[model samples]
Target: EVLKPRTLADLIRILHQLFAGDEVNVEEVQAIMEAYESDPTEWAMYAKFDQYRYTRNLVDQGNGKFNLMILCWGEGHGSSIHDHTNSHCFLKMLQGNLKETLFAWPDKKSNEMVKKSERVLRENQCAYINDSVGLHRVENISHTEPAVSLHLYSPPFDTCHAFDQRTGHKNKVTMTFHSKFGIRTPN
Candidate 1:
């Protein structure tokens, strides 16, 4: 059965309830995200797709413990292979479709990445990755339609590392929002 929160505030309350512990349960968080149904009508106003890149609009930054954002994706836009820098992440598909390709390192000292698997998430579907385990790329698979997703990050991070799988080079990037609470800005 799908769980539907009445509003974004209600959703945040539920998340707070779940995260009030010493350890965050990754599986439980994933289940909550997957089972929760998002109303497109309510989220449509926040959706803003960019032709050059994907856009991330801040929804809520919950104290110092968590953060909420909406990611708008233009067709074929995707991220490079990257790590979350130990921040737990949850993603829920709100509109259109996305394809996530996961990668893994064969050795801790090696820079080579092996393609682990690929998964597709449709509207209302959700997925997550823990701090150190998730290294993947997400892309909007639709040719004509834009995609939007809701993301939740725990112990919110200010920066993350982007990896080049072929070259074994990594770059640290600062995270920024394209907009906050319906107000847009230049990145």
Candidate 2:
């Protein structure tokens, strides 16, 4: 019998299997992310919101290949312009809508970023980006409703750089978790 993905747990397991191979198939991963849907109650345990800024919660610390996180975006809140530090980053919308702005790589000497494109990822939509794709900034675009997204990072990184859009000056920032393994952590 084939096991079909139904709950959030099932989806995580499926993702794990996908990464176990020598090379991950991007198309397969993208298809799964685009097709799977989980009940709100199933993901509620991982979605914790904050009034000041977005929340990042660890869902799984993968078997050395990748890690998963649930990010909760408060209304009027967003992330700083940032890079993935060479890791493959995937974002799947779980609730509300998120506006993602893509930027060209900084100029060699001026260190300035140029806006390339932007789009809104509605619920159930997914996006993938890496350093080669340039940089990006994500934000909650709703006025009243908060937003949520599921993120997967391959070769899980503990730190990344945040860019100053105008000057393109960058600073390395450590990552944090609002929850770990379905349990809330001190923020």
Candidate 3:
């Protein structure tokens, strides 16, 4: 299928339209996200790099119903296994390559997260996950370059749970932003 690159504002408008209804299904939203290719130029303003950790730059927080952010991952940076609570998440790889590993809880009630599968998300590729899919982790997987991705979430999450693979411990983590609207410091 031919993918047409969309600007950040255009993508935000499409998201609003897709979620303006009563309820949204994962398949429908995922399909739309996968089809709407992102133009790097539209998000280059918010691009920032960190050597020790990944940086998340806020793009838009839509009327308290949804939120958008661009995550920049330096070489060797990755996230711990975590869940997005009940929010539906759509991720688009905007630049470089990313390695995503999905996980599953064997007992459903335990903190034991088992590896489900792993895949590489090349530029313009999209992936979707929800609370039902269990947990997952993302890595830049690049030794020399940085990777960037755009994430859209509905009913924007304030907190989510992260699992410790070594100890089966789960804890709620408060989310914070590294930048907002191309600014290094958020107001």
Say which candidate scores most in lDDT.
Answer: 2
Choose the strongest candidate by TM-score.
2
Per-residue CA lDDT of candidate 1, range 109-180, in tens?
546677888989877787887645658889999878888899999888879878778755678988778888
Local distance difference test, each candidate = 0.79, 0.86, 0.81
Candidate 2 segments exceeding 4 Å error: 1-4
Residue 8 alpha-carbon offset, candidate 2, angstroms: 1.2
Clashes of 1: 0
Write the candidate numbers in order of decreasing lDDT: 2, 3, 1
Residue 163 lDDT in candidate 3: 82
Q: Model 3: runs farther than 4 Å from truth?
A: 1-5, 106-112
**What is the alpha-carbon lDDT of model 1 when measured against the actual structure?**
0.79
